[PDB]
Amino acid sequence: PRRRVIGQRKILPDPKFGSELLAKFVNILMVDGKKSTAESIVYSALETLAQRSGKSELEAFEVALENVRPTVEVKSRRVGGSTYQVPVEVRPVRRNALAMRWIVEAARKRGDKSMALRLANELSDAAENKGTAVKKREDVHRMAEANKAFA
Amino acid sequence: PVIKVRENEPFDVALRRFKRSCEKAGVLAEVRRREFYEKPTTERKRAKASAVKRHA
Amino acid sequence: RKQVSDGVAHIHASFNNTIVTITDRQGNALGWATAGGSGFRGSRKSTPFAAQVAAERCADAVKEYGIKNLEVMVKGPGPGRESTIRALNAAGFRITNITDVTPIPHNGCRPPKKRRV
RNA sequence: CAGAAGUGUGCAGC
RNA sequence: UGGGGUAUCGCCAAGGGAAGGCACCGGAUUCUGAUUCCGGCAUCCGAGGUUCGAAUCCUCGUACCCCAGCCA
RNA sequence: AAGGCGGCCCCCUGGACGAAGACUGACGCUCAGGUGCGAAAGCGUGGGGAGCAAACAGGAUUAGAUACCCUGGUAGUCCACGCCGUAAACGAUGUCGACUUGGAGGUUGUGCCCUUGAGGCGUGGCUUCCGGAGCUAACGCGUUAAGUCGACCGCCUGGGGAGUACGGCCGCAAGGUUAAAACUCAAAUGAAUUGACGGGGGCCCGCACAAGCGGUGGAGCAUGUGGUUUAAUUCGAUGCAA
Ligand SMILES: *C(=O)[C@@H](N)CCC(N)=O
Ligand SMILES: [K+]
Ligand SMILES: [K+]
Ligand SMILES: [K+]
Ligand SMILES: [K+]
Ligand SMILES: [K+]
Ligand SMILES: [K+]
Ligand SMILES: [K+]
Ligand SMILES: [K+]
Ligand SMILES: [K+]
Ligand SMILES: [K+]
Ligand SMILES: [Mg+2]
Ligand SMILES: [Mg+2]
Ligand SMILES: [Mg+2]
Ligand SMILES: [Mg+2]
Ligand SMILES: [Mg+2]
Ligand SMILES: [Mg+2]
Ligand SMILES: [Mg+2]
Ligand SMILES: [Mg+2]
Ligand SMILES: [Mg+2]
Ligand SMILES: [Mg+2]
Ligand SMILES: [Mg+2]
Ligand SMILES: [Mg+2]
Ligand SMILES: [Mg+2]
Ligand SMILES: [Mg+2]
Ligand SMILES: [Mg+2]
Ligand SMILES: [Mg+2]
Description:
Protein name (chain C): Small ribosomal subunit protein uS11
Order of helices and strands of chain B: EHHH
Radius of gyration of chain B: 18 Å
Number of strands of chain A: 2
Number of helices of chain B: 3
Function (chain C): Located on the platform of the 30S subunit, it bridges several disparate RNA helices of the 16S rRNA. Forms part of the Shine-Dalgarno cleft in the 70S ribosome.
Shape of chain A: globular
Structural class of chain B: mainly alpha
Shape of chain B: elongated
Family (chain C): Belongs to the universal ribosomal protein uS11 family.
Number of strands of chain B: 1
Subunit structure (chain C): Part of the 30S ribosomal subunit. Interacts with proteins uS7 and bS18. Cross-links to IF-3. In stalled ribosomes contacts ribosome rescue factor SmrB.
Order of helices and strands of chain A: HHHEEHHH
GO molecular function, one term (chain C): structural constituent of ribosome
Strand content of chain B: 5-15%
Largest sheet of chain B: none
Oligomer: part of a larger assembly
Strand content of chain A: 5-15%
Helix content of chain A: 55-70%
Radius of gyration of chain A: 17 Å
Bound molecules: glutamine, potassium ion, magnesium ion
């Protein structure tokens, strides 16, 4: 919008672990409004990640997300006759949104036998600093530093 | 434009002095003026128009 | 090889490239680097960042002689006319003097015709 | 930085 | 006859433990574009000798240019 | 005088203006024909040639690109002595003289006043910008008139054809100058007004873009249309807005 600026809509924290961040993650994994399906998938993935890691569920999720949150992104900036890619310091809320989106979209396209297990594997790899979500973060950073000349 | 950095002068203060000195000397403007030829008719036209706009 | 206490950094900064040359007080070149040679081509070749990188690579090139104090002579209008000096300072040389040596004709020769882009 | 062309011919509002 | 080159990614080009560009492909960018940036499978003219291993050293086989030879 | 004239120094040389007188005594103004000067490009002969750059070559761009952009590059640009004689050679405004409310500045003389200054008041030359009466189709001009008058000269008579043809003069040439007719149309034109438009400027909106999510274009089928077919495949809707 060009007139307005919008105040954020009220979210409700996750009922089992009390996290609004996990609530956002559920809301991103949700499809067609089937909230409870996404909740079941997320809870199964988190408990299996917990028993793999020897960590609490939110602790394992947080340490995974740490490994994939980007620090910079590339933005198209116009000039009177040209357009340049320029690196921009992405703000933390968008960092979390990006990391969750990348985790979810990476897991979705895995081959493993169920979405809960796909998700658990992708979170393990992310916590292990490996795999598709991490390579996504990585190449974003590569592009940013390759464009650093215009910053 | 020449700058001698004094003892205990901060380097960025020396940069500030250098920038202001070379700006005040007009060196960059004189370089930009000379990169292309300008017909004398064009020089006089621009002078005249600048003078014409210098009125309240 | 032979030690040198101090030297002059010559910065040649055109709109298309920046060359940084270190030389002894007598004008014998000790080392050089350029923005275009640091891996920047086209639009990036003439940015202050590319000139900073060129100055850094030039400072890394003269490490043999152990120069500690230098004088900076700046030539030309291009971008990176200043960022090179900051980079040279950060490399740890004592910037003793700064000077602009850009050639100014007292009228002199006729320059090229104006571009009708 | 690139971006060309648009067939002929008409009528009310006093 | 002798000497020296050349035959390595689809094309152009580096290497006693297969790189770069140009293509092609995916992604980012653009009003379309053109232009830019990140990622990608990648491949030593040939037989043998050496050796843990030679695009690579050592003989030979092959093919084509330069210079110099050649009185059935 | 116009074209024009820009580092510093010397030599030769033209004009302008101010103060105070003295002198001559209408000796003045304009000017057909004529004569001289006249940017740049161009021409002749002999030099010089750094930079720039018609022509030309290559690279790009593009549908093409005999261009714009890039890398080179010859005449030319410079000098001496001749020729050419044209320019938006413009203030698009002929020369000369008189008269008619003002204001702010620039530049260059000169007089008076305690000169006290970085000061006050007067009087000439040239020049920039506003604006009054008046004038003008309007825009605008406005004591430097496009105002009110006088003298003389040049020029115009609808748009094309045409500043062309032919003839004359001039020129090494390029060409310059003087200058028609047949024919053809009912307009061509100036200033300003209201819109619209601009790859002009400023400001501001809309799921317009951006940020996201889910789709269409691929498959089968339903349904509408185009085309074809038929005896008939009834008619209408046909960018957005069928
Ligand atoms: C062959 O060459 C024989 N007829 C002569 C020999 C020679 N001249 O070498
Ligand atoms: K004189
Ligand atoms: K005459
Ligand atoms: K040139
Ligand atoms: K075209
Ligand atoms: K030449
Ligand atoms: K007629
Ligand atoms: K001739
Ligand atoms: K009017
Ligand atoms: K579809
Ligand atoms: K469909
Ligand atoms: Mg046509
Ligand atoms: Mg039309
Ligand atoms: Mg000439
Ligand atoms: Mg000549
Ligand atoms: Mg000659
Ligand atoms: Mg050229
Ligand atoms: Mg004329
Ligand atoms: Mg006239
Ligand atoms: Mg006026
Ligand atoms: Mg009059
Ligand atoms: Mg007529
Ligand atoms: Mg004629
Ligand atoms: Mg004639
Ligand atoms: Mg969108
Ligand atoms: Mg379909
Ligand atoms: Mg189809």
